[PDB]
Design a protein around this ligand. Structure first.
Ligand code: HEM
Ligand code: HEM
Ligand code: OUJ
Ligand code: OUJ
Ligand code: H4B
Ligand code: H4B
Ligand code: ZN
Lengths: 411, 411
């Protein structure tokens, strides 16, 4: 159980000892593997919290080469006393930054983790109101976008106290296109957002009912009813999607936004729960062109793209879906690159991830990785991660999923 | 204890009770998932329970559980084990066992076909020449002039592990690979090691790029012997492309019959170490893995040049674009020659239908997402959005070590 992982393309073998530090559970047993289940999964108690805090502080002070020091023992004492009195505790700024960077480092489903130590952490724990949240979020978006030279960032709102005072961003991402169901057939805009696009209207939004309407933010501070806010358009960088060879591609009227900013996850550090912690990076091209555009339960544009290419759509064995899919993803990359907005193709990002794995085995002893999520959704086996065995285990600090607010909120 | 899987494109949810019948182990624990690890001498002591559970299964499937035929067979196997240390399967039992080994093969996307397996009983075989003869008839029957038929040939079971039958080839038909002194490889790099063994055993190698390897056959634990499959029995398909006339000039071909010969068939505790089985190809097995893996024929670049793509930066997706064309050419060539083949769109759709049907009538269908999802265009196939439970059922096909690592040479 000092496990080894082999790359069957290069025969590189790595030995994983970091998994022995694993704490949480995977959902698998020796009788059944759940590696392909999307989600295999009230506040803590004075006795639940301190071991968690100690585990986190132990690794923090190790990482700064002060394990077993005065400063270490003092901080443990101090936190231990604050828990005993206040039934929670507060992270020093340095601990906050470390916890956030390591929650990314530990995200076994993220292919972009070679960047993990360059995260910009915005401490929003002094925030008290949704208007305040909105202000922090606009500043996030502007900093991260950086006129198309995107930078990684996280903004961290106050930690959970009793579950009645939760801070939540109700959007799944800070920037997403609206989705409206039609009186007649399918859906206009983005089908994944149809419910939220209705909870916005059903809460006051007036929708332009277009194909690419940026949704408003729905912000919840200290557990009150959430509030609608419109992100200033000049803060929302968008890329019109054209093809470098097909002039008709422009006529399809497609665009996407430059900033992927996930806002519905929960960040856990030393047992403390940050239920509102939007984080953002930059897109891998397939995220838009393969999933957002071509998933059948999304924009599902493969039909008409192939028609405009005049491919034989009669039999699946012409691979017309595959041919169109390539062209769409060529265009996405072409457009972002042409407008100088940061993006990475799936070849470069998976090659980066192999180098990152290599680094983590060398300087950390392992790297938890979820093959089902790391392998891109197109051209899987011509990327190097396909031939890479991976070990998946849960380390902390971590990002976790949490229920959608509207099913929980005492409205 | 019931378990649920969800299709995230259709919201179809299915309930698995079959995993409870699972006995073997996955390699996973609650604290580590080994879902992407490629690979994770038996006494009378443990054999009657294995026999009994298999016979219980068999007689349940024929609606005779607890019958006198069922009780008598159990008694007969029992006494045969204690007095002879092993036991022999009835013909009906072997046919059932082989079919259910295929049905249980969680990494196989082709299992909708599992009940139409032609079972050839070669348990009376005693010499390598007899093995060659049985394999020839398998190849002729399965190939059927291009109208392929699934088939398996079952050689005598292991006894003391010192008298094993083995097919030393990994597949019955496969191209040789030669390492040249300049470091380049002629032919199929996957088969360099086996090619060398054949040459050492006295095979006179043509030293071409598509030479069919000889059969290397081991009976009753004796040293293996070389045999040449009659070329009129080896159906091959020249690869051309429906629009690119230069594609034929790449000189590529492939054989029509995928027949895997290095696995071990386990039935009621009996181990069948030689059990070649065959079906027909999914297009991507040849077009994506065989031709385009960097450690295989690796033809992407030469196809990319002849297509005149931007090969300077990988964000042009020249690799993805060439990959689609190669796979179009594979499918076109096989259909043109009326050789059975299936594209990855048709095969994954069939699997989903199979899987749903198996949940209904069997209570489950063990499935290995990592292997089921095709190596190109993953998310535009329906299995990508399908949650899957992986567990181990018997009868089963298992990996076994390469015989040249374990064989005691007679000389
Ligand atoms: C900087 C460039 C980044 C790239 C290219 C990238 C790429 C990806 C991709 C392709 C996925 C697969 C999920 C999907 O397909 O929807 C993913 C998941 C994820 N990313 Fe990254 N990411 C980046 C930055 C970040 C940052 C800055 C964070 C947090 C600080 C982060 C945290 C995560 C998490 C937590 C998940 C998976 C959540 C889950 O479902 O368990 N990523 N990422
Ligand atoms: C008839 C059409 C069939 C098709 C299209 C098919 C397709 C496939 C594919 C694509 C794989 C993944 C292997 C890889 O890509 O490297 C696979 C695995 C497998 N197939 Fe099927 N198959 C068929 C028939 C059969 C038959 C007749 C058997 C045995 C009786 C069988 C047994 C297996 C097994 C045991 C595996 C897993 C190998 C492993 O665990 O490494 N298949 N199949
Ligand atoms: C920072 C960053 C950059 C980047 N380029 N891509 C990212 C993708 C994700 C991410 C994480 C989980 C997800 O969930 C799938 C799902 C569907 S239903 C229950 N779960 C999704 C997609 N909704 C995206 C998170 C962060 C990213
Ligand atoms: C009956 C049938 C039909 C069909 N169309 N495809 C099939 C593919 C496989 C199969 C089984 C294991 C394999 O090995 C993986 C590996 C590489 S290194 C250690 N393990 C491979 C790869 N060559 C193919 C087996 C049977 C098939
Ligand atoms: C490391 C990884 O498990 C390995 O490359 C697997 C991944 N999935 C696969 N899937 C199929 N169908 N065939 C394969 O050979 C593999 N190889
Ligand atoms: C059913 C399956 O687990 C689900 O579709 C997963 C598979 N792999 C994925 N991989 C990535 N990167 N993103 C995803 O949303 C998914 N979805
Ligand atoms: Zn698992």
């Amino acid at each position: 159980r000092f496990l080894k992982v082999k790359n069957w393309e290069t025969d590189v073998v790595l030995t994983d000892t970091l998994h022995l530090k694993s704490t949480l559970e995977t959902g698998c047993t020796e009788h059944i593997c759940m590696g392909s289940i999307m989600l295999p999964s009230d506040v803590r108690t004075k006795d639940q919290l301190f071991p968690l805090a100690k585990e986190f502080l132990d690794q923090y002070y190790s990482s700064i080469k002060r394990f077993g020091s005065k400063a270490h023992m003092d901080r443990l004492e101090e936190v231990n006393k604050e828990i005993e009195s206040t039934s929670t505790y507060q992270l020093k700024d340095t601990e906050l930054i470390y916890g956030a960077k390591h929650a990314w480092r530990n995200a076994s489903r993220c292919v972009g983790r070679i960047q993990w130590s360059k995260l910009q952490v915005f401490d929003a724990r002094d925030c008290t109101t949704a208007h305040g949240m909105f202000n922090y979020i606009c500043n996030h978006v502007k900093y991260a976008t950086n006129k198309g030279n995107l930078r990684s960032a996280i903004t961290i709102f106050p930690q959970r106290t009793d579950g009645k005072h939760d801070f939540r961003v109700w959007n799944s991402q800070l920037i997403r296109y609206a989705g409206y169901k039609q009186p007649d057939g399918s859906t206009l805009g983005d089908p994944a957002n149809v419910q939220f696009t209705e909870i916005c209207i059903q809460q006051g939004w007036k929708a332009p009912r277009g194909r690419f309407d940026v949704l408003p933010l729905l912000l919840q501070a200290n557990g009150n009813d959430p509030e609608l806010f419109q992100i200033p358009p000049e803060l929302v960088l968008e890329v019109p999607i054209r093809h470098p060879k097909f002039d008709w591609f422009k006529d399809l009227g497609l665009k996407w936004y430059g900033l992927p900013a996930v806002s519905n996850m929960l960040l856990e550090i030393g047992g403390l729960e940050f239920s509102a912690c939007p984080f953002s990076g930059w897109y891998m091209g397939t995220e838009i062109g393969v999933r957002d555009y071509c998933d059948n339960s999304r924009y599902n544009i493969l039909e008409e793209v192939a028609k405009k290419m005049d491919l034989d759509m009669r039999k699946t064995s012409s691979l017309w879906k595959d041919q169109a899919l390539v062209e769409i993803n060529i265009a996405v990359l072409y457009s972002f690159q042409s407008d100088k907005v940061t993006i990475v193709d799936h070849h470069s990002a998976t090659e980066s991830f192999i180098k990152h794995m290599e680094n983590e085995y060398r300087c950390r002893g392992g790297c938890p990785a979820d093959w089902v999520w790391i392998v891109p959704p197109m051209s899987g086996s011509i990327t190097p991660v396909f031939h890479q065995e991976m070990l998946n285990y849960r380390l902390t600090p971590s990002f976790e999923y949490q229920p959608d607010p509207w099913n929980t909120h005492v409205w």
